């Protein structure tokens, strides 16, 4: 072992450079690390563009009657197509018209 | 802390053994400087010694007459004098050098042997 | 003697603010820091001032430095009786690549 150098009377290739090297690998782990999401404000009663954690579609969003189990995500209609949500950030149900 | 081995009148033209052992911390991540002191007067620089690799570091007027190393076995730096005369009848201070940054500073300090000829 | 003159002898009259100051070569003195230590006789000496501004902790608050340029300056503003001593500068030096240290003037307080 062989000790450096890093005098402040150094120039450029002799001055300490800090290195940090991140590795990543994605093979199997279903909850781990991502960049936030960022959403946006929550318009109603317009034909929007969409995504509901993971749900993407087109639809006008609508207040609902419904009542979701508090595990409950979003509900589908008979014939299996989502017909409401529940908003990640607000915690609200929604319906989805066409 | 540190401390110092004793302090003894020696011959001319011998070879002189100064001990300093370090107390209270760590012991490797410092380094440790050695100056000396002619007696009524103000200090000068002799001797750098790395604890780390086992190098030594020393000054153009004193080079070569001190050899310097260190243990981190026991945390003990053995200064070894040669060619004395009646120029080197002085206090030696084995000292801490804080890292700091821009500025040198000195730490702890230590205390240092008189060495008389 | 060596690379950072100090003038040699002062005194005069105790409870006052008084100063000394330390000038050499550029190569250091100009470029680099001015630590300041101070010698008490019979013992092992202290330490004062790094980077000309920040005591360090415990020591008193009195003392001042200064590196007004080349002028390295301790300020002792309410001298009192204890501190009759050798203050001594000192610099890192990029010439001779080590500190650099100076003769050290001996401070005299009066009764």
């Known amino acids: 072992l062989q000790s450096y150098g890093f005098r402040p009377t150094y120039g450029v290739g002799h001055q300490p450079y800090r290195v940090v090297v991140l590795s990543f690998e994605l093979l199997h782990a279903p909850a781990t690390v991502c960049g936030p999401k960022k959403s946006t404000n929550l318009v109603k009663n317009k034909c929007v563009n969409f995504n509901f954690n993971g749900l993407t579609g087109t639809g006008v969003l609508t207040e609902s009657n419904k009542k979701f189990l508090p595990f409950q995500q979003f509900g589908r209609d008979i014939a299996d197509t989502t017909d409401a949500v529940r908003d990640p950030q607000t915690l609200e149900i929604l319906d989805i018209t066409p | 802390q540190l401390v110092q081995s004793g302090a003894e009148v020696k011959k001319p033209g011998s070879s002189v053994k100064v001990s300093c052992k370090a107390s209270?911390?760590?012991?490797?991540?410092?380094?440790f400087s050695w100056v000396r002191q002619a007696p009524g007067q103000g200090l000068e620089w002799m001797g750098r010694?790395?604890?780390?690799?086992?190098?030594?570091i020393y000054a153009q007027e004193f080079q070569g007459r001190v050899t310097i190393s260190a243990d981190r076995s026991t945390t003990t730096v053995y200064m070894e004098l040669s060619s004395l005369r009646s120029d080197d009848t002085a206090v030696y201070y084995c000292?801490?050098?804080?890292?700091?940054?821009?500025?040198?500073?000195?730490?702890?300090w230590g205390q240092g042997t008189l060495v008389a000829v | 003697q060596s690379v950072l003159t100090q003038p040699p002898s002062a005194s005069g009259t105790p409870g006052q603010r008084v100063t000394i100051s330390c000038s050499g070569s550029?190569?250091?003195?100009?470029?680099?820091?001015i630590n300041w230590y101070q010698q008490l006789p019979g013992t092992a000496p202290k330490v004062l001032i790094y980077r000309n501004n920040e005591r360090p902790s415990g020591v008193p608050d009195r003392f001042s430095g200064s590196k007004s340029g080349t002028s390295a300056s301790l300020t002792i503003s309410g001298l009192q009786s204890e501190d009759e001593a050798y203050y001594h500068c000192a610099a890192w030096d990029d010439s001779l690549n080590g500190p650099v240290f100076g003769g050290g003037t001996k401070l005299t307080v009066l009764g």
């Open positions: 550029g190569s250091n003195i100009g470029s680099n820091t």
């Open positions: 010694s790395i604890p780390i690799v086992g190098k030594a």
């Open positions: 209270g911390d760590t012991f490797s991540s410092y380094t």
């Open positions: 000292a801490r050098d804080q890292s700091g940054f821009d500025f040198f500073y000195y730490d702890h």
